[PDB]
């Protein structure tokens, strides 16, 4: 409840300065206690171009913990973005603090090819 409201507040605050275009989409995240989600939005027409989450074959292809799952989905979304033809994005915290699973996602994508 209040956690949801405060998260939305922080996400809006950070989004005030952060949009993401067609050439440089928005690396948005959505983390839950059980899973995470990530997609590229291109906040110019509201048209998602690539997406990923933690509910795939990776839900059992787990070499460790939630951090390993985040790393795997980072690789997956990086491959999806390369397939789409995207090599620069803007990372969106989604209102959560950078670090942990989010950091694993971010650096997994970073060394998997995305230039952000």
Partner RNA sequence: GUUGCGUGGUUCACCGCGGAGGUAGAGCUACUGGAUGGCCGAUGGGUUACUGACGUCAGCCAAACUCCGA
Partner RNA sequence: UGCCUCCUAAAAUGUAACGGAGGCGCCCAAAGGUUCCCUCAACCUGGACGGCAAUCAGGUGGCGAGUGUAAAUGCACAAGGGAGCUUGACUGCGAGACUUACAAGUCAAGCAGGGACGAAAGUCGGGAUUAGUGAUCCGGCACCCCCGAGUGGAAGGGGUG
Partner RNA sequence: UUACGGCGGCCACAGCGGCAGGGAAACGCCCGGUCCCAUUCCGAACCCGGAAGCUAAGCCUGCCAGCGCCGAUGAUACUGCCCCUCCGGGUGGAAAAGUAGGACACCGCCGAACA
Closest CA to 41 of 107, 86, 71, 72: 86
Residue 97 interacts with RNA (CB under 7 A)? yes
Burial group, residue 74, by CB count within 10 angstroms (0-12, 13-18, 19+): buried
Q: In the range 70-89, which residues lie near RNA by CB under 7 A?
A: none
Tokens representing residue 67 in the block: 């951090």
Smallest gap from residue 113 Cβ to RNA (A): 14
Out of 9, 23, 61, 84, the only residue in the binding site for RNA (CB under 7 A) is 9
Nearer to RNA, 74 or 91 (CB): 91
Question: DSSP E strands: which ranges in 20-99?
Answer: 26-31, 36-40, 50-53, 90-91
Residue 48 interacts with RNA (CB under 7 A)? yes
Q: In the range 16-45, which residues lie near RNA by CB under 7 A?
A: 16-18, 28, 30-35, 37, 39, 41, 43
């Amino acid at each position: 409840a209040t956690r949801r409201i405060s998260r939305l507040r922080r996400h809006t605050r950070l989004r005030k300065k952060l949009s993401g275009t067609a050439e440089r989409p928005r690396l948005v995240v959505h983390r839950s206690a059980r899973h995470i989600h990530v997609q590229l939005v291109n906040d110019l027409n509201g048209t998602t171009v690539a997406a990923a989450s933690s509910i795939e074959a990776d839900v059992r292809g787990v070499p460790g913990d939630k951090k390993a799952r985040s790393v795997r989905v980072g690789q997956l979304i990086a491959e999806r973005a390369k397939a789409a033809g995207i090599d620069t994005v803007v990372f969106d915290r989604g209102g959560y603090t950078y670090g942990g699973r989010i950091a694993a996602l971010a650096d997994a994508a970073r060394e998997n090819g995305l230039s952000f």
